[PDB]
Design an enzyme around this catalytic site. Structure first.
Site, short mmCIF file in Angstrom:
data_model
loop_
_atom_site.label_atom_id
_atom_site.label_comp_id
_atom_site.label_asym_id
_atom_site.label_seq_id
_atom_site.Cartn_x
_atom_site.Cartn_y
_atom_site.Cartn_z
N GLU A 48 0.83 -1.18 0.00
CA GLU A 48 0.00 0.00 0.00
C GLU A 48 0.88 1.25 0.00
O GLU A 48 0.75 2.15 -0.84
CB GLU A 48 -0.99 0.03 1.20
CG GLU A 48 -1.79 -1.24 1.52
CD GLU A 48 -2.81 -1.69 0.49
OE1 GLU A 48 -3.02 -0.94 -0.52
OE2 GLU A 48 -3.43 -2.76 0.74
N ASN A 173 5.98 -12.62 6.09
CA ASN A 173 4.58 -12.99 6.16
C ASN A 173 4.10 -12.88 7.59
O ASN A 173 4.85 -13.18 8.51
CB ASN A 173 4.42 -14.42 5.72
CG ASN A 173 4.70 -14.64 4.23
OD1 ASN A 173 4.65 -13.73 3.45
ND2 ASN A 173 5.00 -15.87 3.85
N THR A 222 2.38 -13.12 -1.08
CA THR A 222 0.97 -12.78 -1.02
C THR A 222 0.85 -11.26 -1.28
O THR A 222 1.55 -10.43 -0.60
CB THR A 222 0.36 -13.07 0.37
OG1 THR A 222 0.45 -14.46 0.69
CG2 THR A 222 -1.10 -12.71 0.35
N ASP A 226 -5.59 -4.15 -3.82
CA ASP A 226 -5.76 -2.70 -3.88
C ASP A 226 -4.41 -1.96 -4.01
O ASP A 226 -4.40 -0.86 -4.53
CB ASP A 226 -6.59 -2.21 -2.68
CG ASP A 226 -5.81 -2.19 -1.36
OD1 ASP A 226 -5.00 -3.10 -1.12
OD2 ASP A 226 -6.01 -1.24 -0.57
N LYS A 266 -10.16 -19.17 -4.59
CA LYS A 266 -8.93 -19.55 -3.96
C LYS A 266 -8.34 -20.83 -4.55
O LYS A 266 -7.16 -20.88 -4.89
CB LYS A 266 -9.17 -19.78 -2.45
CG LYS A 266 -7.92 -20.03 -1.64
CD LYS A 266 -8.23 -20.31 -0.17
CE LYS A 266 -6.93 -20.33 0.65
NZ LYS A 266 -7.30 -20.87 2.02
N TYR A 267 -9.16 -21.85 -4.63
CA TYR A 267 -8.78 -23.12 -5.26
C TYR A 267 -9.37 -23.37 -6.67
O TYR A 267 -9.57 -24.55 -7.08
CB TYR A 267 -9.05 -24.30 -4.28
CG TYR A 267 -8.17 -24.21 -3.06
CD1 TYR A 267 -6.79 -24.47 -3.14
CD2 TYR A 267 -8.69 -23.85 -1.79
CE1 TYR A 267 -5.92 -24.35 -2.02
CE2 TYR A 267 -7.83 -23.75 -0.67
CZ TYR A 267 -6.46 -23.99 -0.80
OH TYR A 267 -5.65 -23.88 0.31
N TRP A 294 -9.26 -10.55 -1.95
CA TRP A 294 -8.37 -9.89 -1.05
C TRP A 294 -6.90 -10.03 -1.46
O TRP A 294 -6.13 -9.08 -1.32
CB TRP A 294 -8.58 -10.46 0.38
CG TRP A 294 -7.88 -9.65 1.48
CD1 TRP A 294 -6.73 -9.96 2.14
CD2 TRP A 294 -8.35 -8.44 2.06
NE1 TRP A 294 -6.43 -8.99 3.08
CE2 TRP A 294 -7.43 -8.07 3.09
CE3 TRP A 294 -9.47 -7.64 1.87
CZ2 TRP A 294 -7.59 -6.89 3.85
CZ3 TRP A 294 -9.63 -6.51 2.63
CH2 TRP A 294 -8.69 -6.15 3.61
N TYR A 295 -6.52 -11.23 -1.95
CA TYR A 295 -5.14 -11.46 -2.34
C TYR A 295 -5.04 -12.55 -3.41
O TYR A 295 -5.99 -13.30 -3.62
CB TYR A 295 -4.26 -11.87 -1.12
CG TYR A 295 -4.71 -13.16 -0.52
CD1 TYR A 295 -5.75 -13.17 0.38
CD2 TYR A 295 -4.24 -14.39 -0.97
CE1 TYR A 295 -6.31 -14.37 0.88
CE2 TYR A 295 -4.74 -15.58 -0.46
CZ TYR A 295 -5.76 -15.57 0.48
OH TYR A 295 -6.30 -16.74 0.97
N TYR A 392 -23.90 -12.66 -7.94
CA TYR A 392 -23.36 -13.67 -8.87
C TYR A 392 -23.03 -14.97 -8.17
O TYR A 392 -21.98 -15.56 -8.41
CB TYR A 392 -22.18 -13.14 -9.66
CG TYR A 392 -22.56 -12.14 -10.68
CD1 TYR A 392 -22.83 -10.78 -10.30
CD2 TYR A 392 -22.69 -12.50 -12.03
CE1 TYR A 392 -23.16 -9.81 -11.21
CE2 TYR A 392 -23.07 -11.51 -12.99
CZ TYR A 392 -23.28 -10.21 -12.59
OH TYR A 392 -23.65 -9.33 -13.55
N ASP A 533 -8.97 11.46 12.08
CA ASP A 533 -8.00 10.79 11.18
C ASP A 533 -7.70 11.63 9.96
O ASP A 533 -8.51 11.76 9.06
CB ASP A 533 -8.59 9.44 10.77
CG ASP A 533 -7.62 8.52 10.16
OD1 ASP A 533 -6.84 8.96 9.29
OD2 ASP A 533 -7.66 7.30 10.50
O1 LIG Z 1 -6.32 -2.34 7.82
C1 LIG Z 1 -6.83 -1.18 7.12
C2 LIG Z 1 -5.86 -0.01 7.30
O2 LIG Z 1 -5.81 0.34 8.69
C3 LIG Z 1 -5.00 1.50 8.92
O3 LIG Z 1 -5.11 1.90 10.27
C4 LIG Z 1 -6.34 2.48 10.70
C5 LIG Z 1 -7.20 1.39 11.45
O4 LIG Z 1 -7.84 0.44 10.58
C6 LIG Z 1 -8.26 2.13 12.33
O5 LIG Z 1 -9.24 1.27 13.02
C7 LIG Z 1 -7.32 3.01 13.20
O6 LIG Z 1 -7.63 3.17 14.57
O7 LIG Z 1 -7.05 4.20 12.42
C8 LIG Z 1 -5.95 3.73 11.60
C9 LIG Z 1 -5.26 4.91 10.93
O8 LIG Z 1 -5.79 5.43 9.74
C10 LIG Z 1 -3.52 1.32 8.53
O9 LIG Z 1 -2.89 2.62 8.73
C11 LIG Z 1 -3.42 0.75 7.12
O10 LIG Z 1 -2.14 0.24 6.76
C12 LIG Z 1 -4.44 -0.40 6.88
O11 LIG Z 1 -4.42 -0.84 5.51
#
Ligand SMILES: OC[C@H]1O[C@@H](O[C@H]2[C@H](O)[C@@H](O)[C@H](O)O[C@@H]2CO)[C@H](O)[C@@H](O)[C@@H]1O
Ligand SMILES: [Ca+2]
Ligand SMILES: [Ca+2]
Ligand SMILES: [Ca+2]
Length: 701
Positions: A48, A173, A222, A226, A266-267, A294-295, A392, A533
């Site tokens: 990401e 992982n 993995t 997105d 998946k499979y 998801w992956y 679907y 946030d």
């Molecule tokens: O897993 C989704 C996404 O989460 C991100 O952190 C969030 C979290 O999900 C939320 O509940 C928290 O308290 O706020 C944070 C900060 O924005 C994380 O930063 C991402 O890497 C992740 O993909």
């Protein structure tokens, strides 16, 4: 000016003095190290973060007319987090021995980590991979050109990097044990498992799978669907903004070609075939759901005695991972990134439509986007519950993939995808399309969403909420979803507040097409948990900005809601600027979840002892027996015991002292304040920077 604010923040992100990047030029999850949320340490990084970096450099490159930094970021991604190494050691050994008629061996997923390892039974034979042949033909290779999702940038887990030992950043992982394995409950283990760590002779494999021989040394990557898609989305914008170096455009194409693996069960089981609990293998594209699950994961042997490899798709699809801008980019002449494979473009075309239908299908009665769907109920192809709504032939899920916490509760999972649907509305209209089913779906979805979201956005006012997180109205009543929500507020100049989470109930009605959509009167989003946030603000601002902009291209002027969305974007940007600390736009956050550093809830099976990357014996002696109700028999250790070097973190003292002085282990509650932090997350700062940039580009002009 918004341009200036964009450039300011860009320089703050890039500056060597600020510490957003490692010495090797790799962006970290966050400047701070003591953080846990998806990556479990702040100097991990993610695919990401790489995709966000590319997005940032695209916009900067457009403004400076110099694409050199975009190219350098792509080369860095390629060197450190995409496990393809034309030149040095093979990072996917034995991928050539992949058997596309038997991509992998079936194992069930489990409702608790306690039930792992899962038997590799091959109970359900895997279906055909119908793209392996095209990819080999197109590229002369089947080495997967996708980012691995998780990189240990400072070698904090100390596994090293087996196949590229001069790289400090090592492939790691975590998640591998079903829906209840939170970030706190996973065990970091190297993607390249030569069994030099973990249990002697076994590595970490026997935590996850069991089979009747000793597991061979092996590797396993993995992606996150997105992330690669956002990389492609960034290259889409670059090309629209004049970039045209083929060398890199073609790399985005190749990435989109391999990303197709995210469209498969998946499979490789036929889509829908598990509805009555008896799945069967897909033929041709019969296992293609045309969504981003998801992956995709791929693995194979290490060393000369292990000449095999495998692939899985994924059965669970989450709305918040779909990227129809990437799908567009990859499927049309105007998108500009059609792959050269025989069906890459045409598969992405179907996907673009199917993603838009998915959003419409999932939209609650009040406008929020519910979780997703699966082709594998309980992850073992269980029969769907009586009366479960389908899309679907895939069963609706309120929390696809993960349940701890429920994966579609976080409001970020609204902003992120709705930003992209807004982008696509804009793109369609700008490309001269006001009439297709696709623009009508995109537009309908985002128009309803913007209406929904604007009830919970507060600039210069503080919403009223109760101690359980519910928004209250002027009469003091909880607001439990519904349209026309009127949140009570007090005057609070210079503050902003956004929604934090959604509590979901009910189901969409079964999908029958856009012409028969019902409005999902039994699907309810209750929006809650007002927060600050700044990452989510940045993503929201872009959603509002693109949507406004689209409405003016469509009609000649900002529509009623276009006007409101434009003003919300502009107001959010203005108040947000005051929260720049010189390094990022930031706010303080409470982390009540940080008792889970200490809780004994990391599962290990009975009879399993080994060595962790940091040198400690695991599970070790600091354990309690697992909960019999979760169906295992093993033990739990803590996040902190598993990772003793965390005690060396500069912030560790004050966290442990706060836990000691405030958390009540009996009630499970923080009594004297929860831990507080101010974090500089890479993705978040990029979402903010790009918000100023795109407001300037689309609205200021
Ligand atoms: O897993 C989704 C996404 O989460 C991100 O952190 C969030 C979290 O999900 C939320 O509940 C928290 O308290 O706020 C944070 C900060 O924005 C994380 O930063 C991402 O890497 C992740 O993909
Ligand atoms: Ca590489
Ligand atoms: Ca759990
Ligand atoms: Ca070139």
């Amino acid at each position: 000016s918004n341009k200036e604010r964009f450039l300011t923040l860009y320089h703050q992100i890039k500056s060597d003095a600020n510490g957003y990047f490692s010495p090797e030029g790799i962006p970290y999850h966050s400047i701070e190290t003591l953080i846990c949320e998806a990556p479990d340490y702040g100097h991990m990084t993610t695919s990401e973060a790489y995709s966000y970096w590319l997005w940032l450099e695209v916009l900067y490159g457009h403004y400076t007319r110099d694409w050199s930094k975009l190219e350098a970021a792509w080369d860095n991604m390629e060197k450190y987090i995409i496990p393809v190494n034309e030149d040095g050691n093979d990072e996917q050994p034995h991928m050539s021995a992949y058997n596309p008629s038997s991509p992998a061996t079936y194992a069930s997923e489990k409702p608790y980590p306690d039930q792992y390892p899962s038997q590799l039974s091959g109970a359900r034979p895997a279906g055909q991979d119908p793209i392996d042949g095209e990819l080999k033909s197109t590229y002369g290779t089947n080495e997967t050109y996708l980012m691995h999702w998780l990189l240990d940038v400072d070698n904090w887990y100390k596994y090293g990097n087996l196949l590229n030992p001069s790289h400090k950043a090592a492939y790691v992982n975590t998640f591998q044990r079903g829906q209840q394995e939170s970030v706190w409950e996973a065990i970091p283990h190297p993607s390249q498992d030569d069994k030099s760590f973990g249990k002697p002779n076994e590595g970490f494999m026997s935590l996850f799978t069991k089979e009747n021989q000793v597991p061979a040394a092996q590797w396993r990557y993995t992606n996150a669907t997105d992330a690669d898609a956002r990389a492609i989305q960034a290259i889409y914008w670059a090309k629209e903004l004049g970039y045209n170096n083929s060398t890199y455009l073609d790399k985005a194409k190749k990435m989109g070609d391999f990303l197709r693996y995210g469209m498969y069960d998946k499979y490789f089981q036929t889509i829908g075939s598990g509805k009555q609990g008896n799945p069967y293998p897909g033929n041709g594209k019969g296992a293609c759901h045309y969504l981003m699950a998801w992956y995709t994961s791929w693995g194979g042997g290490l060393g000369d005695y292990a000449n095999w490899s495998w692939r899985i798709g994924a059965s669970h699809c989450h709305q918040g991972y779909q990227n129809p801008v990437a799908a567009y980019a990859l499927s049309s002449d105007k998108g500009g990134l059609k792959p050269s494979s025989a069906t890459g473009a045409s598969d992405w075309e179907k996907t673009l439509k199917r993603q838009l239908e998915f959003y419409v299908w999932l939209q609650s009665k009040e406008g929020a986007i519910a979780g997703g769907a699966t082709n594998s109920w309980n992850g073992d192809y269980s029969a769907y519950p009586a009366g479960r709504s389908t899309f679907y032939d895939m069963a609706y899920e309120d929390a696809p993939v993960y349940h701890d916490p429920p994966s579609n509760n976080w409001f970020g999972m609204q902003a992120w995808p709705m930003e992209r649907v807004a982008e696509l509305y804009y793109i369609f209209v700008k490309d001269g399309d006001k009439t297709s089913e696709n623009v009508q779906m995109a537009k309908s979805c985002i128009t309803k969403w913007v209406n929904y979201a604007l009830d919970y956005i507060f600039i210069g006012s503080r919403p009223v909420s109760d101690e359980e997180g519910y928004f209250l109205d002027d009469q003091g009543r909880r607001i439990l979803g519904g349209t026309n929500a009127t949140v009570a507020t007090t005057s609070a100049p210079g503050e902003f507040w956004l929604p934090g989470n959604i509590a979901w109930s009910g189901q969409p009605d079964t999908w029958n097409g856009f012409q028969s959509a019902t409005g999902n009167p039994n699907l309810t989003a209750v929006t809650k948990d007002p927060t600050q946030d700044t990452g989510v603000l940045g993503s929201l601002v872009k959603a509002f900005t693109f949507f406004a902009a689209a409405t003016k291209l469509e009609t000649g002027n900002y529509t009623a809601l276009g006007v409101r969305a434009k003003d919300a974007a502009a107001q959010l940007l203005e108040v947000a600027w005051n929260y720049n600390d010189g390094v990022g736009i930031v706010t303080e956050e409470e982390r009540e979840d940080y008792d889970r550093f200490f809780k004994k809830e990391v599962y290990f099976p009975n009879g399993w002892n080994g060595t962790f990357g940091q040198g400690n014996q695991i599970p070790g002696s600091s354990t309690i027996p697992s909960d019999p109700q979760r169906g295992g028999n093993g033990v739990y250790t803590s996040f902190a015991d598993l990772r003793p070097n965390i005690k060396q973190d500069p912030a560790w003292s004050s966290l442990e002292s706060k836990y000691q002085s405030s958390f009540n282990e009996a009630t499970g509650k923080w009594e004297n304040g929860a831990p507080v932090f101010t974090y500089h997350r890479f993705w978040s700062q990029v979402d903010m920077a790009t918000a100023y940039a795109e407001y300037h580009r689309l609205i200021n002009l």
